[PDB]
Ligand binder design. Structure first.
Ligand SMILES: Cc1cc2nc3c(=O)[nH]c(=O)nc-3n(C[C@H](O)[C@H](O)[C@H](O)COP(=O)(O)OP(=O)(O)OC[C@H]3O[C@@H](n4cnc5c(N)ncnc54)[C@H](O)[C@@H]3O)c2cc1C
Ligand code: PRO
Length: 449
């Protein structure tokens, strides 16, 4: 193939100057909206930094120990007068903060606390990249069991206010990374269909997570078919992730808008930046192809996310946008771009368990409690230590990258105004300095170079 699908294919690895130049005016926040976003982003970030007055205290150590000792003198007068194992253990130590529970039942029992404050959940049974038939079957069973449990705890609250599930197509088909069209359709699809039908019976959201870029196309074929199942007609609980770090992302949105039209539904669309960037670059560098399927400067991903957010927010009849981010500017800009006259079903935010709660405690909840009154859905990984590895590694990359917001916020030296700097302005600043808009990262030449 269709006009919308062909356009996706042709953007796969489009030159970065070109891609970024095309996104720029689509992402630009109008003057007024830009400054309200700056102001809200600044406040959110400031409050995150200075939680227990960790700024005002920052404004030696030897004297403090002596001063401490003197203050333990009770009477003022007297005071005046005078390899394989270490890796496994490191992974589960760092990983506990990211896991909401070992079993789906323990994860749900712990859901009341934030659900009452207005948070929602999407549970993920940890596991991906099934190698064998037995692995994939076992994932299929863990997903079914999860859907029964979440569905019973949802108890009719529905797709927006109630919990959902997130699934990985790589978990449901052995050797998914290289599987061909015909075998995926014969084997993967019936399983996707079956879980989705089950999610529909309990009226919970079911979201298909996005993985590596060479699986985008097949995920779209699977989604297309799913959306035309007679048994799913009139049901708007199907969710799909799109990754703004991909050059294809805006063309994927055009496709999704048309799909929602043709299949007569509202799609739940989770807009993310993306989790596999280090691997995507390495992959593209090994295949020696004409370009990258992702951007090479982080600020360009920020610009793509804003442009894509506008596209999504423009079609509320077709798309329920789920804006996944821990970046205060991103959050603030979405909040402003969504416009006046918010209603619950317009959009929600999302965050990963162990990363987002502090930012979103300023967001989800009552205006009279100093909150924004916008719902946030926490992504909640569920499983034991043997299913954690890949997810943890991705979190370490995310938390430890010096371009990450969550890394830069903890950097006292970097002033708030730089931390929440408008990405469009940053791209324009780079373009005046370097002589062209959207030049690739200077340390990431094309694969053929
Ligand atoms: C609820 C939730 C669900 C998610 N589901 C998925 C999913 O299904 N699939 C998936 O891939 N991701 C998923 N993610 C996104 C991913 O896990 C990261 O959390 C997300 O990219 C971090 O973005 P941010 O806005 O919080 O942080 P920011 O710091 O603003 O941006 C971080 C990122 O920018 C990108 N980046 C970093 N360096 C560069 C560079 N040099 N050039 C271009 N881009 C760069 C990467 O995407 C990286 O994550 C999910 C995130 C959340 C919160
Ligand atoms: O697996 C990951 O890293 C992303 C984050 C949440 C869901 N998918």
């Amino acid at each position: 193939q269709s006009v919308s699908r062909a356009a996706i294919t042709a953007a796969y690895r489009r030159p970065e100057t070109e891609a970024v130049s095309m996104l720029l005016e689509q992402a630009r926040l109008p003057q007024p909206v830009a400054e309200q976003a700056h102001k809200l982003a600044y406040q959110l970030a400031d409050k995150l930094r200075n939680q227990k007055n960790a700024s005002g205290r920052a404004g030696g150590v030897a004297l403090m120990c002596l001063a401490e000792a003197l203050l333990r003198i009770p009477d003022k007068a007297t005071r005046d007068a005078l390899i394989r194992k270490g890796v496994d253990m490191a992974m589960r130590l760092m990983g506990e903060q990211f896991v909401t529970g070992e079993t789906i039942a323990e994860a749900l029992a712990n859901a009341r606390k934030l659900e009452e404050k207005g948070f929602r959940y999407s549970y993920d049974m940890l596991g991906e990249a099934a190698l064998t038939a037995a692995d994939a079957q076992a994932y299929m069973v863990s997903y079914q069991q999860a859907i029964h449990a979440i569905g019973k705890a949802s108890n009719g609250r529905g797709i927006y206010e109630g919990p959902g599930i997130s699934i990985k197509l790589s978990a449901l088909h052995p050797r998914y990374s290289r599987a061909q069209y015909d075998r995926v359709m014969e084997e993967l699809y019936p399983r996707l269909k079956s879980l989705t039908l089950l999610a529909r019976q309990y009226d919970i959201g079911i979201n298909i997570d996005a993985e590596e870029s060479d699986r985008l196309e097949i995920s779209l074929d699977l989604l297309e078919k799913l959306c035309f199942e007679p048994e799913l007609a009139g049901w708007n609980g199907i969710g799909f992730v799109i990754q703004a770090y991909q050059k294809r992302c805006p063309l994927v949105i055009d496709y999704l808008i048309d799909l929602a039209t043709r299949s007569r539904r509202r799609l739940m669309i989770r807009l993310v930046k993306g989790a596999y960037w280090d691997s995507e670059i390495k992959r593209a560098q090994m295949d020696g192809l004409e370009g990258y399927p992702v951007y090479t400067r982080k600020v360009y991903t920020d610009v793509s996310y804003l442009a894509c957010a506008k596209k999504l927010l423009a079609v509320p009849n077709l798309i329920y946008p789920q804006f996944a981010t821990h970046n205060a500017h991103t959050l603030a800009a979405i909040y402003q771009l969504a416009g006046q006259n918010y209603y619950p079903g317009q959009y929600e935010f999302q965050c990963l368990h162990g990363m987002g709660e502090p930012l979103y405690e300023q967001v989800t909840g009552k205006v009279a409690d100093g909150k924004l009154n916008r719902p946030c859905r926490i992504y909640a990984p569920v499983g034991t230590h043997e299913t954690l590895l890949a997810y943890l590694v991705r979190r370490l990359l995310e938390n430890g990258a010096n371009t990450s917001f969550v890394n830069r916020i903890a950097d006292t030296s970097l002033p708030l105004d730089e931390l929440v700097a408008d990405p469009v302005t940053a791209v324009e600043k780079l373009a005046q300095q370097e002589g062209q808009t959207g030049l690739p990262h200077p340390k990431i030449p094309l694969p053929r170079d």
